[PDB]
Structure formats: structure tokens, C-alpha cells
Amino acid sequence: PQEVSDIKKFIEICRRKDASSARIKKNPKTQQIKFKVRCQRFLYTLVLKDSDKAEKLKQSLPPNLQIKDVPKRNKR
Amino acid sequence: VNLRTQKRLAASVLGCGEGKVWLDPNEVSEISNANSRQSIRKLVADGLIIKKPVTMHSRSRARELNLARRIGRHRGFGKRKGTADARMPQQVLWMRRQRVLRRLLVKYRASGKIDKHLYHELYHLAKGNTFKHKRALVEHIHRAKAEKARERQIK
Amino acid sequence: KVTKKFIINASQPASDKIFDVSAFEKFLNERIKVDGRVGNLGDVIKISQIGDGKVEIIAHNDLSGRYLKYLTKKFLKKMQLRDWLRVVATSKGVYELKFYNIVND
Amino acid sequence: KSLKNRAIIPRKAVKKPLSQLEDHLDQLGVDTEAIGLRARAQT
Amino acid sequence: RRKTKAERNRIKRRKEEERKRKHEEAMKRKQQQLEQAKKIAAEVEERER
RNA sequence: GGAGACGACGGCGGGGGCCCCGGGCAGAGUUCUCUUUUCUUCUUAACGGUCUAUCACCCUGGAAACAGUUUGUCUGGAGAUAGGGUUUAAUGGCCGGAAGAGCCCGACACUUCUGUCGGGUCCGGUGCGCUCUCGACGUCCCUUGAAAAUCCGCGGGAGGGAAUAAUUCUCACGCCAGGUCGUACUCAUAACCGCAGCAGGUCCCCAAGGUGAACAGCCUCUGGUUGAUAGAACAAUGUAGAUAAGGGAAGUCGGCAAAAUAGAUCCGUAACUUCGGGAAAAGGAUUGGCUCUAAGGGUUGGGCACGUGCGUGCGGUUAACAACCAACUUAGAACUGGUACGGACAGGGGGAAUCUGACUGUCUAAUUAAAACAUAGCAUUGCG
RNA sequence: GAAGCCAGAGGAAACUCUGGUGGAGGCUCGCAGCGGUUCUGACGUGCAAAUCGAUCGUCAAAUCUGAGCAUGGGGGCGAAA
């Protein structure tokens, strides 16, 4: 797993061909949001403070990339 | 009806020993019908199988004895069983004292209370066991300072 | 100065006249200790009734809901209700008294 | 109590009989019929 | 000259303060890029084109 | 050329885990009285990123009034101290992984099928503790404590290399592939060997709390057992464990056996001696409980004048002062119970001599453990 | 409590004395382990074709121990019985 700190590099990673899926994890107790994109070798996580612009980053994300919200319970 | 399998399965499911497993003695046939870990989990959820709490081992007497020994009880000759060095090593005491004295001398030299020649002399006196503690070393330093001041006033 | 707020909700056994809220208030007034001393409440701790079988405790010290639950269990044992009434924390600072689960026989 | 050898089972893990609860409340002096203990008890 | 314990502790506090300042500045740079996300995506798409 | 790749032992320092202490939420038990109580959960992997961590190395400079410095006396004109840096080394801090998991609690639903939804999972402290690991030292040797597969660095400069662009880049990302067995269970008072489900034998890790010097003995927690033909009675003689008035070895081949001694603090300790020992020689004084007193530590913190939280130029060593934090030993005193105070447990009887083998060590598995054997030392013989 | 080391007091120096430090030894008390001294011991068609209890020797090394390998009956191995 790798942290991405640059929004430009995160956008290029999300536009990579081997980016199969992506998910959004909301941590309201720490007031933060995590964008996790699954690629071939690594899972890339971008950590942001929760905000309106942090929500509109999903609009700048590619449309063909499937993006899902992480639920409160990880049902098997 | 034999419930050995159910007791073993319930111990594995609950994550405890088989001596902590409680099977309901009024629900023996229903528990006997449970042959899977899923059925055991179902009975645990319904409360027909529970995990008993641990047996008590309190530390209150140990803590009370520790407080009494801290304030100074139970320390007599009738309570000591090891030799004095076995209870408290002279090597540990000497190492602590040397570290205290060297730390104080380092502090004094760095702050400028003593100079480097006096530091070296006091270092070798402390290694040669002149000072019993920090207070004795401090009094020796004060006496040396007074002697140096008297010599400077005379000269 | 920080202020902490506690509710003991005995509304339901109070309505069934099993739990006496006035006696419970008297017990809390005589058993709550500040700096290790009973009868040392003053303005630090205030105990009152807000109606509908509920006891209201205002504390300015570091009084704990675990201590309040411990005193409630002591009162239940004194009134011979410990084997039948349960004190459960339902929300933050609110401890509610209810019956244990009953099986029809 | 047998606390030297084992722990007491918690009260919340044991179902309490309605007859015993009614008898104890009656001995304490509570009108159990006036409060209706029958509708509360599970089956 | 030989430095004292207070001077050494001052140097240590200065180094920790510098590290904290760098971390805060990096977080603010990330926030600024988050504000400018759409232009960044346009630039990435143009570079790919 | 380096790695692989290396003894035993000693203390010291760093880190993980365990143990211990305080607060908080939640749950449980106690509750004649007392107990803001006692107990339980409160966790964070591999793999990565980043910032740091003893040794050592580099730069300035030139040290006697020698200095630096470890518990342990080593280092320095072959360049110390000081100041500033560079680096080997994480089981350290933060972040990704990762809260979505696991764990705890609650509220509903539920013939079963099946569950669903809330709340929380936090903050500190300590150490001659236990265990593993890492580091720097040190001691011992007529003893100096593997090899190979395998991987890397360097010396060399053969080749191969550009603007029709080239690239033979140990960088990042991306593509493809990874065969064969073995894997249950026991590892022992019933799974192995002893003819057996035989009180024998058979190689290893992991190892909690109290007492205490202590993986001693005794009690407890987790986890395991409650398995070894049973019931009744209490004769003789037994086996095992005990006591006994007065005398105290009169017993017996022979003090065999038992009893007595025993921990710790303090006083004191002969002949002989290879000077190292003898020695815990001998012979004495003490030890409970309670309430106090004293001593032994850590961390942080100095006034001006300018430029502006750092740089100089000064000035002062009573910080010999304040604030905060912390643990276990040692000594002294009063009071108090007593038939006992190392109250169980644990735990030398001692002395005067003689013979004998120098000592440590070894052997007759299943009747002899010894003046027997070996040993270091000494002497002889043979061999260029 | 051996060398080495520090301090103090002497001594012209060599050295001498006192207090510390250090941690040597086929040293020592003693737990496990290893061994097997004693007892009118238990057992004596036994739990056992050598076992059981108490007691005892040793316990940082000439200590204990596994696996792999070597030595084979005119032999081997033997701190030697």
C-alpha cells in the first residue's frame, strides 16, 4: 500500500489502464476522507480533510473508473 | 445424550477453555441436535450456550502489602532472608553513585561553576571514593571555591 | 469550571411503586462522598428530582457515572431488588433501571 | 457464593422465572396485578 | 566554547519546530492542489492527448 | 575484495514482548457493615514511505596548569577536547496497510431460513524485574573456535553508443510464468521402546500472580484433569508418618536410626599452612506487629547592548535557588502482643586426632566408587 | 573475592599501609539436569529380567545431550574394571 500526497499524481494513477476500481472511505471521527484506487501492484491511498472540494474531486476522477463508498460493515 | 462434541465446538467458537463453557441443562436435546459450528453460534446467540467469566484472582492484598512496604513495614531482620548483597548489590549502588557524581560534575563544568582542572581533579576524587553522595561533593566544591576566593583575596 | 450532568432513570419501577425515588435521593445525599467524606456535598454536587421517576445529578468535580452506578447497585441490594433490577447505561450520562428478562412459566 | 472455585454467572445471562419474580414482589408488598407482570414476560 | 544543556534543548526545540512547519506547509500545498483539482485534470488530459 | 562465515564466559547500555501502577468509558461480581470498590475488553501483522537512533568517519584547530572519559582506565601532535557535519544499525515515532478488521457493550427482530441497527475501542507512569534481541567493551587459551553453493562491489577498458536523433539506463509503472511430493493425529502414568493401555526409558521450545536471594518449598490465575476396582469395619503383625515423664548411649560389633543445627544482621574466630587457605572454624548477641524519623535521585529554567524566534559584543558563577516528577533499599527511635517472631515452608551439628590418595575427574549397566585408573610434574629410551 | 585500576597517607626512589573498584578460578553452598553414597528402607511369582522413597555426589567444566558419520569378533573400543 502506498500513500499519494500529490493530487496530480493521484489523477494520473486513476487514469492508468490497470486501475481496476476505487473506493471512498469517510472517517468522520477524525474528520477526514480517503480515496483508495486499486491498481495491479499497489493500492494507492490519498488522504484529505473532508470538505466540499474533497467531494468534487470525484467529479475530476475518470468516469469509466468504478467508484464505490465503503459501508460501515464489511459483510463477507 | 452425549454432549462432548458440543462442548468442544462451543469452546472453539467462544475462544475459551472447555471448563468455561456452560450448556443449558434444560435444553439438552436441542443442544444435542447442534452438530455444526453454525448451529453452535446460533445457540450462543440465543443464549443456550454461554461463556462463564474467569475465576477471581484479586491483587488488593498485594497492593496493600506494597504500600505497607513502601512506608516501611515488614523490613526487619526477621523478614530478611537473602544476604545484604543479594537484596541490594554494592555494584549497583556504586554504579548509581558514580553516575550521579559524574552527571553533577558535567552539569557544573557546562554551566561554568567549576573549571576544567577542578573538574578533572574532582572526577578522579569521585572515582577514588572521596564523596559519599551529591551533597558531599557539593560541599567539597563549595569549600574549594571558598579557598580559591580566599587565596585570590590574599594575593 | 466544568459541569457534568447525570440522569438516573427509575421511571418504570417508580410507576410500578417498586423503587422509591425519594428514598433513593436520600440515600444518594447520605452516601455520595467528596474527598473521601460523606456529608461533604456543598455546592460541588447537587441532587434533585426532575419528575417522572428520574434523579438529576449536577457535579462540578470529577464524579463518575461508574460511581453513581455502584451506589445505585448498593441501594438495590439494600432494598432487596438487586436480583431483579438492572442498571443499564442507555446513553451518555443516563443510567436506566429496568427488569431483567422474564420467562413465562 | 462459591467465589473461591468459580465465578458467579451474570444475572443478565439467566432467565428469571415469572412465578419467582411475582412471589418476591408480593412479599415486598407490591400489587403485581395492578402493574400487569404477565404481558411483560417473554415465552 | 562548550554549549550547555539549555542551548542543546533550544537547538532540539528549533529542529522539531522546523519539522512541524514543513509538515504544515506540505498539507497546505495539498489543500491548494485540491482547490485547483479541475485545472490539474485538464492539464493531465491535455498531456495525454 | 566483501558477504555467506562462525568459540566460551562476565558485567553495562538500547529496543520488542511479558509483569506492575494511575485515570476514563462500558459490562460483571460483592454489599449485616465497609469498600468513589474487586475483576474483564481497551488490539494493530507482513510489506512500504518518512523522520530519527551507540560505533565509526570527515572539516576547522593545535592541547602541560595535561585533557576527555567507562560500573570496569582506556584514548590523544600517528591530532585529543570543543564546535560543526557524514554515515552502519529499528523489534523507535508518525503515516499508508487500517478500522472497513478484531474485541467489548446496548436496542430490536427471530418457528427455522436468517439477522439488522446503534455506542465505544482512550490517555498516561514505572523498573538492579522476567524473556528474546541488538550494540560497545572486557576476560581465557601450549584450546584461537567449518566448508561449499550463492550474491554484490571494485580494478581494467574490450565492445557498443546521438541529432535520418540515439540509448546495451542495476529508475518508476506495465506484460507473462512458477512443476513434484510431505501436510490428519499422538509425542506419552493408554498412540514410541520395554511380550501390555508396564510407577521404567525417550531430543526440543513458550512459561503468569504472591511469599522469598531464588524457574527452592507452599498457595493461586489461564488452560487442563478429577483417570487410576469399590462398600463396611478399625483385631494382631506390618508399611508410612508422629509424640512421650525421669535418666541421657547404661543400647549395640559399631550412636545404625532418630534427635539436635540450619535463613539473615551484628560481635568474634585457634593450631597448621604450599601464605592462596583453614573459615560459615570455634564461641556469642538479635529477628513479630504498629507509628514515625533520617539518608541515598531525575527533569527543566539566568541579565544587558545592537541587527532581527536566531547572530554577535559583553557581563556572573550563592541556580548554594525555584517548579515539577519518581522508586526501592538502608539506618535510627518510641509504642505494643507473646508459650513461639527465618512462628508453615525452607534450612551446616560442631570439635580433637590417626591412616590414606595431592587436588577437579573416571570404572566394574544388574552385589565391590575405592589407597583402583587418569592427571599435571618428573625421569629414561628410540628416531634427521 | 585473583590480576588490572582510582584515591588518600608515608617513603629520596623502589616500594609500604588504608579505603574503594574490578570480577579470576578444571573454587564453593545450592535448583533443574547428570550420577548413584547410605538405609537390619519399600518391593522379592515386583509397577520393573534392577523399579520406588528418603538420603547423598556433582552442578560453568576432564559438564549433560540429539542427529549424521567412523572403528567389527584371530577384531574393535577401553581415564584399565
Q: Residue C52: left (phi > 0), alpha (psi -120 to 50), or beta?
A: left
Give residue C104's identity as a one-letter amino acid code. Answer: N
How does DSSP classify residue D42? B
Q: Give Cα B137 to chain centroid, integer Å.
A: 31
Task: Residue B50: count other Cβ atoms within 10 Å of its Cβ.
Answer: 19
CB within 8 Å: E44 and A12: yes
| Residue partners of A72: CB distance under 8 A and separation at least 6 | none
Name the residue among D25, C21, D27 with its Cα closest to residue D36. Answer: D25
User: What is the enclosing helix (H) or strand (E) of C37?
Assistant: strand C37-38
What was the structure determination method?
A: cryo-EM
Distance CA(B50)–CA(B27), nearest Å, equals: 13
CA-to-CA dists, residue B145 to B84, B118, B155, E36, angstroms: 38, 10, 15, 69
Measured distance CA(A30)–CA(A47) in Å, rounded: 11
Is residue B32 within 8 A of residue B6, CB to CB? The reply is: yes
Indicate the SS3 state at residue B44. Answer: helix
| Beta bridge partners of residue A47, listed in sequence order | A34
Neighbours of D37 (CB within 10 A): 19
Of the candidates C17, C19, D40, the residue with the CA atom closest to the CA atom of residue C8: C19
Q: Which helix (H) or strand (E) holds E28?
A: helix E5-35
State, as a whole number of angstroms, the distance between the CA of C88 and the C1' of F27: 9
Give the helix ranges, DSSP H, for B15-128. Answer: 28-32, 37-46, 60-71, 84-87, 90-111, 116-127
Q: Which of E1, E3, E5, E7 to mutate to test the interface with B (most CBs of B within 10 A)?
A: E5
Terminal-residue alpha carbon distance, chain E: 63
- CA of B116 vs chain E CAs: smallest distance (Å): 11
Question: Given an 8 Å threshold on Cβ–Cβ distance, is B56 in contact with D9?
Answer: no
Residues from chain E that touch B109, judged by Cβ atoms under 8 A, are: 2
CA distance A51 to chain E (A): 10
CB contact under 8 A, E3 and B107: no
For helices B116-127 and B134-154, give the axis angle rounded to 10 degrees: 140
C-alpha A59, offset from chain centre = 12
Between CA B49 and CA B21 the distance in angstroms is 7
Between CA C32 and CA C46 the distance in angstroms is 10
Question: In this structure, how many other beta carbons lie within 10 angstroms of the beta carbon of residue A33?
Answer: 20
Nearest CA in chain A to E42: A60
Nucleotide nearest B128 (Cα, C1'): G7
**Could you say which nucleotides of strand G lie within 7 A of any protein CB atom?**
6-8, 19-23
Residue identified by cell 467528596 is C34
Nearest nucleotide over every DNA/RNA strand to the B94 CA, judged by C1': F71
Residue type, D17: P
In chain B the first and final C-alpha atoms are separated, in Å, by: 108
Count of C-beta atoms within a 10 Å radius of residue E1: 4
Which residues, by CB, come closer than 7 Å to strand G? B 90-91, 94-95, 124-125, 127-130
Say if CB B9 and CB B40 are below 8 A apart. yes
Neighbours of B4 (CB within 10 A): 8
Distance from residue B125 (CA) to nucleotide F263 (C1'), in Å?
Answer: 39
